[PDB]
């Protein structure tokens, strides 16, 4: 032929562990979670288009919205001064106030439509999630990222942001706020997972490796928390981390011992329950842990306030009542 198939990403890359340098053309999945400064910014194409769907929203009886992704909320912070100003010139007595992010970004059952108002913050019964919009933005085009109002109301994370890759038997599912690594050592299992957000949308199988023959009851990161339905989302001896410490919001999951503690495998151990932290509220360390039928190293999370263990890792001797847990 005479066609140059560089519709892709062209450049060079060096691998520290593999000890080679490779150039060429293809697909580059970058880690947009462990970046030092903000690589991507959310922006709306038309704030006035957004102002329409916000009036229209309250006219539908909607009191507020809950963000899907963290960058959506951070967009809502920079954007709220002008959204209230276009509202002021169009003289609607409805004020937009946006607060900060809880742990999980809970989903809401209402939605905006294309053409006081509380963005995020904590929960409230005066403006419940039943009346909050959620997942009504999709990506338009593009470092900057432009957003537009969505068509249909479904429960799936914006596919235009997701990515996955597998090579040299190391697998990755990635997001603006997720980074899930799996690897082949005897068997395929999850090894690390990084979170800047924890969302409540569904990971679309179109962006999932090995999405066949999965029992959701064995997915480590739960489906309801944007867990990918994949056999890479698997660890032998662990089941879904439904009650993991997802309330930390930003956390680091992996498989190793928490500092100063030990996990043993014993059938005498307690059943799997809500995740406990290794330090009491007073700062005491609980050194001896166990699990009934898990596989070492233990599933451990690390967050802003210390080290937590997977659901199946219980204290060996210490009574659970003295421990901080995630309910």
């Amino acid at each position, epitope marked *: 032929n005479l066609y140059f198939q560089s519709n892709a990403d062209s450049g060079c890359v060096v691998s520290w562990k593999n000890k080679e340098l490779k150039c060429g053309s293809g697909i580059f999945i970058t880690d947009n979670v462990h970046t030092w400064t903000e690589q991507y910014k959310f922006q709306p194409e038309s704030p006035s288009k957004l102002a329409s769907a916000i009036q229209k929203a309250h006219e539908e009886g909607i009191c507020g919205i809950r963000s899907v992704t963290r960058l959506e909320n951070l967009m809502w912070k920079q954007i709220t001064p002008e959204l209230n100003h276009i509202l002021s010139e169009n003289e609607v007595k409805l004020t937009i*106030m946006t607060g900060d992010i809880k742990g999980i970004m809970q989903a809401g059952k209402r939605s905006l439509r294309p053409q006081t108002f509380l963005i995020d913050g904590p929960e409230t019964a005066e403006c419940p999630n039943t009346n909050r919009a959620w997942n009504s933005l999709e990506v338009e085009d593009y470092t900057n990222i432009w957003l537009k109002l969505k068509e249909k109301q479904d429960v799936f994370c914006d596919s235009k942001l997701m990515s996955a890759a597998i090579k040299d038997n190391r697998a990755v599912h990635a997001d603006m706020g997720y980074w899930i690594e799996s690897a082949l050592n005897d068997t395929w299992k999850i090894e690390k997972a990084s979170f800047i957000e924890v969302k409540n949308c569904h990971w679309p199988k179109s962006h999932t490796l090995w999405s066949n023959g999965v029992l959701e009851s064995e997915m480590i990161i739960p489906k309801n928390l944007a867990g990918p339905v994949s056999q890479h989302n698997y660890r032998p001896g662990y089941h879904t981390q439904i009650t993991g410490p997802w309330h930390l919001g930003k956390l680091e999951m992996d498989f190793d011992f928490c500092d*100063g503690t030990t996990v043993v495998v014993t059938e005498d151990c307690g059943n799997r329950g809500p995740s406990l932290r*290794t*330090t009491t*509220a*007073s700062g005491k360390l609980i050194t001896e842990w166990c699990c009934r039928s898990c596989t070492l190293p233990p599933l451990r999370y690390r967050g802003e*306030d*210390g080290c937590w263990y997977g659901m199946e890792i219980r204290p060996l001797k210490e009574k659970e009542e003295n421990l*901080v847990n995630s309910l």
Partner: single-chain antibody
Amino acid sequence: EVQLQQSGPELVKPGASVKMSCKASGCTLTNCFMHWMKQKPGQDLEWIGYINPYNDMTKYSENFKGKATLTSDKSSSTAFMELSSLTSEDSAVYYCARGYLLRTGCFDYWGQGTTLTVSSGGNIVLTQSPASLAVSLGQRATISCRASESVDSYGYSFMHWYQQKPGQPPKVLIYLASNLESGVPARFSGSGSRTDFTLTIDPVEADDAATYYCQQNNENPLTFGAGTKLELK
């Protein structure tokens, strides 16, 4: 359980850098988070951040990210703090205290302080009431602390009370809203939940004249009250 030793006082020229140290004893990897706080002469305390020398885990409060740099030496288990470009607003007593991670413990044990002279939808705010309070021996002294947002997590109140005599580091009295720190006389008590807490001294005595601070560690940044100056009649 832990002993903190801060470096001597420093007199610096405006615009230059200064580095102060704190050496810890009785630490382990799991505790030993060395926190740093700033106190203008007779003022509230600002939380700068912490650094654990074994881990090199660090955190800064937003106000100080360009200003402070926290570094460590695992070998001696010593923390160092560097203070960028210096102005007269940086003159204060800078305390190094041992603490823990976010919703964890209180400032158990304290360094003696290093005195710095420069010459040639947000934070949780604690409001203390009253600003000053005068009382006689045998009476009941009541100091209250209002948090603008709940300081509760996991069924605990991450709220603490400290007493500070002049020219001295604070001392822990009440931790977790209501627990009597070991070695503190039972006449001190704390209570409350969510956003409303009260310290009570009953009966107040000759020794108890000091300034009383509430502090929270439910969310970063850590913040203090304005203080309550308690004085005898």
